[PDB]
């Protein structure tokens, strides 16, 4: 017996991967954010959050 109340589908299920690439034009999905472009390593300092 499933159900979809007001709040989310939490229980939900598994999302998978693929491979990085880097230095090549690649279509793009990164945990939700989609795009297209060369993805080289950076030099930024994102806060751990």
């Amino acid at each position: 017996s499933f159900e979809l109340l007001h709040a989310p589908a939490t229980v939900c299920g598994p999302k998978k991967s693929t491979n990085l690439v880097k230095n090549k034009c690649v279509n793009f999905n990164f945990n939700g954010l989609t795009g297209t472009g060369v993805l080289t390593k950076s030099n930024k300092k994102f806060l751990p959050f």
């Binding site: 109340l5 007001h6 989310p8 806060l47």
Partner: peptide, 28 residues
């Protein structure tokens, strides 16, 4: 100035319309 970094997100669904502490206690 000191900003407040996130610490959780409890994905509950209760409707809160009151509150209280359980024992200095400044509240805004």
């Amino acid at each position: 100035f000191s900003a407040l970094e996130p610490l959780v997100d409890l994905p509950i669904g209760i409707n809160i319309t009151r509150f209280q502490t359980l024992l200095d206690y400044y509240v805004g």
